[PDB]
Structures are given as C-alpha cells and as structure tokens.
C-alpha cells in the first residue's frame, strides 16, 4: 500500500500534487486484476486533474511516494519488487492510459549483489524515486506512469487465487514537456491489459525460493 505525494523537477519540489497534477486514486489499494482498465492509471486514471508538471526534456524527475503520511515508512517492507516508469502521449484529458500507448523509460528490479529490490531503495530514500526524462523527447504534453509491483503474494496468480497475486501500484502524472530540441516520439505502444499476463515469470514470481534474478515485465527501456 502506497501512493504519490508530489513530483520534484531537478530537486525542486513542485508541491502536493494529489488531484492537482497526479491522478490520485482514492486510496492506496493495489490493482491485481490484469484485465482491469485501472491497471494503467489506477482507479481515477480517466479523471483529469487541472495542472501539468512543468519540465524539460533531460530533466531529473523525482516521484515521491508515501503510505499514510508524507515522509513515513512509504510502503510495508514485505512488498518487495520492481519500480518502473513509463510515458504516453497526452491524447485528451479523458484518456485513461488504456490501449497501445506506453513506452518504458526507466526500471529497477532485483539487485543480486545486495539481495535487495527497487522497493528497499525507495524506502531507504524516504519515498523519493528518481529518473530522467529522455533528452531527445519531443516537446508536448505527456502522461508519466510510475509503478511499484509488490511480490509478497506473487507465488500465486490472481486468476487462480484472487486472494493472492502480484500487487500493482500505478500512479499517473500529467507533464508538460519543453524540448531541448529532440523530436523522438515514444513508440513502443505497450498496452498493459494486453502485455501484462499471468504467465509472465515477472508476475507469476515466487520470491520465497533461491532465485538469482528477476525478469522485469514489459519491453526494454525505450531507445530514440
Ligand atoms: Cu500493500
């Protein structure tokens, strides 16, 4: 259980973004059904919010997460898993993130050398998760998506056992990107409801065995 508080642009806190520039869900509950239209942007994913984070291609963004209060324990430390960041064109304010529209721009999963996950790093960083907006990005409005996946119950799949299954915590942020040039348009066209499957070894994942690696679902990080 976790959700976003705000976005920071090159270290500068843009301030509480909840229902302002983040499409904040009503609570911290996970998405588990891979056929849910909420998988892309969570339950209020289709409801527009009035502001866009102002940023430039190349900027370092920080997405800040919390559990119940800003700057708390962030997420239960049992919720080990990856954290991925994605981008889609802002087609209209009533878009909900469904369809073949996403490109992955950043990911972190399991680090064998420290036996730790993206989630442990998030906790250690007090909920701050950094990534770069690709410098080649064409200016325009975009939806950014960041997702924590918790694998404490991923040793079963939701379709067989709806009490268990991977837990997805997607957050969608509206961003208005100034270019530094660059004309690259995100083109992986990844669809979550089609591309995340119960057969994926990164979703049907048993963390309670002696694994050396974790396969992060979806395509590799977008090129240019
Ligand atoms: Cu939880």
Numbering used by the authors: 1 to 224
What's in the article?
To understand better how protein structure might influence the similarities and differences in CvAA9A and LsAA9A substrate cleavage patterns, the X-ray crystal structure of CvAA9A was solved. The Cu-coordinating amino-acid residues are MeHis1 and His79 (with equatorial distances to the Cu ranging from 2.0 to 2.1 Å), while a non-coordinating Tyr169 occupies the axial position (2.6–2.8 Å). No exogenous ligands are evident within 3.0 Å of the Cu-ion indicating that the active site is mostly in a photoreduced Cu(I) state. A ‘pocket-water’ is bound in an H-bond network with the amide-nitrogen and oxygen of Asp76 and MeHis1, respectively. The active-site geometry of CvAA9A thus closely resembles that of LsAA9A. However, there are some amino-acid differences in CvAA9A compared to LsAA9A at subsites +2 and −1. All three of the subsite +2 substrate-binding residues in LsAA9A (Asn28, His66 and Asn67) are different in CvAA9A (Thr28, Arg67 and Val68). For example, LsAA9A’s preference to cleave Cell4 into Cell2 (as shown for NcLPMO9C18), compared to the product profile of CvAA9A of Cell3, Cell2 and Glc, could be attributed to binding cleft interactions at the +2 subsite. This is because, though CvAA9A shares the same fold, active site co-ordination and overall structure with LsAA9A, it lacks all three of the subsite +2 substrate-binding residues in LsAA9A (Asn28, His66 and Asn67). Crystals of CvAA9A were soaked with Cell3 and Cell6 oligosaccharides but this did not result in any catalytically relevant complex.
